[model samples]
Target: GWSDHDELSTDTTLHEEKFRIEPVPVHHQLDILKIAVSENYKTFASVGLDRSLVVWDLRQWCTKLVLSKEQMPRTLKAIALDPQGNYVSLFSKDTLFILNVESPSLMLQHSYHSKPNSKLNVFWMPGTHKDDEWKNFELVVVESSGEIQVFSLTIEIEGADIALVEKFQLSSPIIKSISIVSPTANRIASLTESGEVTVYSKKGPVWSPKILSQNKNYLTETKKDIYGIAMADILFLARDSGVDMIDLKNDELLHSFTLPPIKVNTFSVGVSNSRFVNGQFRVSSISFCFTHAVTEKVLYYYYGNESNESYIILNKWDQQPNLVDVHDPDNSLASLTFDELQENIHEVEDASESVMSSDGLYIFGMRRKSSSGISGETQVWEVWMYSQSEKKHRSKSLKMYNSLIIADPGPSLAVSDRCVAIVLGNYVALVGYGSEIFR
Candidate 1:
């Protein structure tokens, strides 16, 4: 007998209420440390301190799959889901685990405990085709020993296992951050903690550092403890103080945001050439840059505070001059404050972070507050949003509650053009702003 149910085929509308409160079923018992979103914005992956990797379906708002430590025996440090959402790369103590998310099985696993290996970061190298949907991709891994490993990844058929095509390493040390500025141009850059910028490229057969012969002078002038992002042909580097933009072709400092002069080994030299410095004055101010996937705009966000009040500034990266001018009030697109947003919650321990959608229309704020009052009800995580054109702000408190609740750390925030990924307590919540949710 064939069973037919009308409810099974009924049109389901994800009403706005789904986002206003209790978006998804919260069932995690541990805290998440990092989150990575897929290229299609339909799926995302998250890793937790509990050593579990969980993937979520953005449309369904449910856990698609979970990879436990028993399945992959290692303490998961980070997860990098490929742009096409086909593969998920996991970095543990000394192992590189690659799995096909669609196949739901381990494809390739490599260990590097032979040489005191500790992986700090992992990223997918851009595809060769400009507009190709799915192509064989590659990945680059940065280790604590100051080495870079690159692996070529390929697949055969739909749901087939991932194949490691080729592998190579760039001998590097003290690389704090690495980025491929122009993937099509085959230009890659790495920044060291000691203020050295190294550029690598592929000419014919091999990848080498010969592409940076012209930019040696500017490399030695980079500030220490820097983070970088690649937008088209330019590389944006952020430091304890300000931002610097480097021309990928010439390897020259095109523009810089001048901050207070930093004392560099008894040589007090200015980081930028600008004469006017703004109010951005913090070595601990957290910052990052985003290059819009579909547009020509490059956005930079810096989380800083004045008089103990925290704020976030959204600024555009101008190539001509005054690169990422956060101090110029006109350069700022939007500004937010924690004090204003937390009016309902009083004297509570809070965790907050901001993320922008790839399409650049929406910006999100994730906040978690736990009051000292009794009962688990005193703790809650909130999803807030701001529309670029509508100039609207909306927020809703999550219904998940537990006595073991943990405050939201900054790194647990991730967003895509379609949804926002948040790690609240142990649960990974995928939130969307579809109009269907409202109806």
Candidate 2:
């Protein structure tokens, strides 16, 4: 017998009281709809408004797998987490299910009924991977009756098999958004609905259509500033009043963050790297979250009062740039106190959100403050750092609550460089400062 177990290799925590407490926030019973994080940000997936569907393990932030609506009887709006940790693709309001979360009852698969199709989202297409540590990838489903079907999941341990690796026919049968300029998605672009702009390139492996030549006017002002995305090697311009950075392959204008008139149709981006410097393609660090659409009598008196709210324009772009508004009390904000929950904060939370951190360089906009009851025998999730004053990939939050909870509606955030997931009011909270369950 050769197993003496001196230290017991391959990273063991042995007895695991979870390393002496410090990792709490995860509770879901009702409202929590749509959450997805993967790109090795520790993998997580969520869909809850009731008939649950949760699968998380943000490196032990915990909640391995759950699916109940009687084991699963329709109630998934969207969820996709596959960086090869074994499939998770559930989207219903139409149909698209492929779950093989490493088997054993987490194994539920089959459902692809293709009517006019048009469900419009389910992605994992960024370089058909096949060995980086976990195995196989490449799953993109954009059934718009337009054309796009790429699958090659082949992962297996108990259940995983799919093959149909390439199919393309989209010039516009009714496409609305998909722009993968890089990440080896092999140069792709498709946007239409009267705007029409097609650009695809991936020869021999098949998928070819190139027709986006309006030279940076980008089809005349993106056909009227029509929402945008593609933030890793350039092009993050979607403005309703604030947010811009362009260099669509050498057409320069690498920055813009005005404080304009407000119309921003809900936005978010938090990139951390994109460098080819000294001659272009620079997005060395980034973070932007724009959302300002408040009018419920000025959002019940602008986000510091009685009810539901909206306000966000958190900005960060390195090596430097700034603008933040936690409803800005005349700037000068920098606080990261949690010397053991600091007295369990109470006021300053009038609703805040401008979140983005799925391995896209940290950036939060949660100006929180919770602790008045129901958060279980003393559990305080913390985060509230601001810099220009706290430094590096900055943060700003004051959230605290741990027996699990959030009071009203509007609380759905996703940030992952490891962990920081939020959704309170049906509850789902995980905020561990330097995440990965606080080391």
Candidate 3:
């Protein structure tokens, strides 16, 4: 079976046979900053530079409601959805707002204004249980100064919808990234820009962190920039070269492997920022998630190329880690060439970001295209799916399976198992394709 999958077909004409794009109604040029899909995949939200927050209903394939001016954050930095899909959280440079997504209007239930220099990341806590207490859903706000604030969200049919419950500060340094594994585990992880990681556990209203037994030598060895993601008790660390997995409960180093350096020309160095090397774009996005069907974890990252060619690399980690060279041809799950997709050279430039679904089944990306006669540079969305045959393999490989093009290009995108949503000029475009594409 593995042998048959090794020679899997690359014929993509059949891959996009059922692909189709559905347009939503809106006007302003959408400079989408962030997008998030609800847990049930029934709806999603997008926020853009125009200072507008929009919600789209997937079933109807239309905009449900839009908020602007006093209703939304003055400057939206990030957007997130609760696990139950009951609420949407909006974060600005210095404020956080929790709103009931099902309200008649875009109802703002709670708001918190932080200090000017403060940055924020928001997450919804798992529902707490007690026969005597009301069904309590809490929210956690992580500040730039490493302060963790928890608020108990009280949902009422009427007034005083949300209230603050508990607040506590972690001894963590400046937090670079944070992730909650799941609601039941109640495990919180925060990574500092300097490469230190701290894990915390929540019991009822009390929060406590475990003693981080980090290897001092490992910390000083790799002084490179690091990004992190968490799935249950396993914490993943991403660097330019490779990835590391740490056990969150015991702070134990489970696996560490170095990736080969991505080749880059000296001329592209310092072209704009450090991400550019030679004339090629460097790796810009990394995503990881646990695959429930196969009972393992998968990691994916993309590397850029000159002349519209790039690659999406894939790796799977189980109890035993593979130490093979990631740059090997076998490691690349997909080869991305704008030519195969029938696009101009300018279309694939500046692919600065991407998002992956929680099940590791799909990935969505936006790339800027050349300017048209009347409009400025436009963006298009690309969707990729993991091969069904590869689901049983330890290395969960995937390939670019479909492409969705919109007349009004969007800069941001979100993907779920059933739908693909993008931010277009003032409107959130919804694209629903059949499951046949996964074949």
Candidate 4:
């Protein structure tokens, strides 16, 4: 029977628990590679140092097949799957492969090349067909030469293949990462080796680039001063220093944060409906996940030490902290009740809090301080919501991973369908049923 569960739904209470990590045995130990789950959450794809593509079916929670071609092409670097889950693409060394997985035996494998394609990175978008959500979509891939290919997807009763329809190039050498912005799927953001990042709107040739701050000038704030810029819209690399808000549309530096010069190992954006949760951002060597289930907030793990993991929360894009006065330390920061921030948070008991959403934001490093810090038990996860009456931010800590698990760093990690998939350097772990985040 069709059910109406929304009426019975109540706010999730604040609770903290560790999450469990289920590692799918890699017959080859691929060394944690790129990972992405199907949009509908039926399957996940992983590529690793072991030079193989691991396709795991979530229904049974097991590795279904190990797809491989040549002998570990330059150490498999990244992976991308079509939005509809029809194609799985892998990047290794200098080659990119597009494979059809629904066949009796995976068929129609195509290999394409980009100058130095070893750093091959690609993203798939729904084609321009009418009723695209119901029709087969097209595929888009980024080449090492900074060229992007827009292709058509043809599926026969026998197999499927991708045919290139358009080719475009970026004005850079190395393309570090590529992401399509929300709402308007046509806009694409690419980060390059030159430490220069560009935002292009996908309209045929009129594609233009808006240069965010560059990283070539300095390697570190003290050395050369190249702020390591790793971005995903809501969270952007400002001057390569750390995460900051660089308004891409207007090319304005709205809000910024400066971190000590150090290599940023991991980065991601947490998307939410409200401004408070969506504003939580992070860049780390580990992993990150965003959940709109609660408020739109991000969960990330940064590895500066071998022992502990530091957890954090951020203000939403729209809401400011309850209090901010730079002149006085006491007034410099303030805190709010979950009720003050979001209706759901009202049930949470008051705790020590700091409010800074409205005031200029500050970033404290994620450094583990004690031995008790290292463990799935020590993980941190949260949900933040907004209070329309009060112009501020509020949130709660929800359930965490159930066991001892490490949120490893890798190429792809996404949150969708009441779950979060963390793609590691070697394996793909799916955290399910609950919000995609773990404590």
Candidate 5:
């Protein structure tokens, strides 16, 4: 009797407490190259220089899966999420990885690999094309010699491999950007240095091209430049002065997206959107809309000012574009914002650095504090989130690591309606409003 009560009393003190909540940063051993959030705001993925991919569940603010390079020789350069939130693809210059993210333990619900030519720049096309068959995905590879190829990507559970697809040609060796928006990879919106954004669609496999307008030699007013293009149902034209949304299906200008008048060293968001495609920046990269599935929104881009600051613009494409201007007034923007960081962070790859929520209430952009002893091997970073709707600017400091970094590194960011995910160097963290019941 004494022994039984003694054991019971000792067990009473222990009372089986729930798991300890050690709220902390997510894990990555190097700078993150790219980040993509699903439309639902429930999931996000990032590729880091550590040759790893981390898929996160926003509900728990924790990693759901981590993909290693296995036997691959290089880091994944680009990543794209299925607009439907079912698949994700990441690739290097020559190797491509397509995986199903719909399962809990099996991002490998199935997989496939596509190996294209080396040295040429490649872009990952997003989402399923609402086709009858759902097996094939698409890739756009533009060679240095003005040759463009569209490769169909697919995979299988046991020994899945994709065959090489089709080809097209451009007169200019320079490509600004390429977007696909049709079933079976039939339609594509491609930009060139010639400033011509031609809408190319499939003509019985011939790939017919319809010229919209050529604005590249654009030297008109101080404010105009046809900087970028994206075709996702509607055609989006990026310019410094404003964004042009056209109904390519109907052959009409749908609307022009502009921001509130700003005077000092000012410009619209999409300014200089395409120059990062190739050049002195040939090796660089590129968005998220409110909803998931690669980059799709009101057709906007990052606009930094002369005073050395950046802003995130979220536009909802409707009869009139509801442009939400979200900015971290205290921080500088990342696309060519500083040379010190760019030189080393090219230490990283040239890649995209922002994400948005579906409702347009939140937009997240990442930039380095760019100080010494902060981010070479060291991983101290800052997260400044401007919740315009909530009327608050939360600037939280994320400090980890054993202490050691060389200089300014790069930052990658993604956000949903209720959560924000970020990375700077070897660390990844989340700061946002969410329900704790999720854990």
Candidate 6:
């Protein structure tokens, strides 16, 4: 019955949960940076600094396949999968590999090398060349410096081939991060170190590159540089200052919500849409950014940098003024931060947030606290969950905090009916035995 939910004293009080934490082995020395689960949820893989790819079978908690690269001098960076799960792709500092697990061993391997070679940043895009319109599998990769390269993953009667299709160089010094905008279509978004994001268009194998957005007023532009880039309809960029979104179609500013004061080290988006509609009802999710630890600017910044954290009085997008409208300006939601809590709480040393599921309004992140005894004391970790309620004009509520987590605590979370996978730098935690919450 509906009574299964725990009772709350006040609607504003943050919710808590009973959760379990388990551990998964690390394939690399550093924590796993990129993780991908197969389509049916039968298998998953972990990639990190070791520059090795390890695939795991969930049923037995065992390793299925392991591959290490001698060419990638540095740790591996990113990993992903094709939709069918027929092939898995792993990218390291300077090497790229495509694994066909159906054979029980490595089936395909693509090594990228050039004079003073560059590491490849590859992502899967929808559509194939043989489709008469688009034609081939488009793989996008960015090098250490500001070089964007496109390749085609094609299957002809003569076996599989990875061909260097095209290349684009940005005015920025180095391409920090790259993500496919619409793989099914012709657009790709590339972000660089000089605070510039370029949206490149691919017209049936041909390439066109242009700087669609600059980092003039972006909060990150004032700090270091743009580190990561994500896009659905609106382009999302992340830096230490905060996260911002820009409208691509209308060339208009929709909204730029900033994190209160914490300096964000890294963040990623789970799902997005331009208010997609079916008929009368619109299926859309509200956007929010999860911040990690704040950098120590001064002594009190760790407690709560009210001066820097409240960098909120920036430009706000003006909604289209209406001719016939009877309504008050929608009140901004209250701040969700350590300072906002009335109770005395430990200062946050580190935290990270990533979306796990889009079917429900779920966002997952972790918080860590550093001790104050010796030179550098031990730290503690906790997992947090935030979900938007169904009620009208509701604020985001903290749903759960699991304190048993023990690791680097830069955890990545993914959920299913029976379990939650909390991933950290060195381990992939499988939590399921505590409660049957998936139903």
TM-score of each: 0.62, 0.29, 0.61, 0.53, 0.56, 0.60
Error of 2 at 229 (Å): 10
Candidate that would win on TM-score: 1
Residues 1-439, candidate 6: write the lDDT tens digits. Answer: 1111212224332332333344565345555666777544656777655666677766556677776645343645556665444466666455667666544544456776532455455566654544422224667776666677777886443346788878777776554454444422456665655556677766565666667553457534533223221223455555545545555544454444444443433344432222211111111233333344454421111111122122111111222333444432222222223224221111223344333343223434454433223332333444444333221112222222232223554445454433556665455655442234321
List, residue by residue over 131-218, the lDDT tens digit for candidate 2.
5343555666665566766676655455556666677776556444454535333545555554455655564466677554333433
Query: Residues 107-206, candidate 1, lDDT per residue (tens digit)?
Result: 7777644244464677776545344344556677666566666666554444323334434344546555555534335555665554555666665557
TM-score of 4: 0.53
lDDT of 4 by residue, 112-131 (tens): 66555235556666654445
Q: lDDT for every model?
A: 0.49, 0.45, 0.46, 0.42, 0.44, 0.47
lDDT of 1: 0.49
Q: After superposing candidate 2 on the true structure, give the runs of residues whose Cα lies further than 4 Å from its correct spot.
A: 1-27, 30-34, 37-45, 48-68, 71-78, 81-279, 284-376, 386-420, 423-426, 429-439
Q: Give the TM-score of candidate 3.
A: 0.61
lDDT of 4: 0.42
lDDT digits (tens) for residues 1-439 of candidate 3: 0011111234465435444344455433445666677655666677666767777665555566678656665677567777656567777765556666666444454457565477777777655534433445667777777777767665554522556666656565554545554423676666655456566677655667764434444544432323333332455554434446455544567545443332211000000011222222223122332111122222243223322234322212333445543344323334443223221111122332233333333444433333223222222234333322122111112211122223344444444543456654454444434532122
Worst 10 residues of 5 by lDDT: 1-10
Candidate 4: minimum summed lDDT over ten consecutive residues — where? Answer: 356-365
What is the full ranking by lDDT, best candidate first?
1, 6, 3, 2, 5, 4
Which of candidates 4 and 6 reaches a greater lDDT? 6
For every candidate in turn, the CA RMSD to the true structure comes to: 12.0, 20.1, 13.9, 13.5, 14.4, 10.5
Answer with 3 or 5, whichever has the higher TM-score: 3
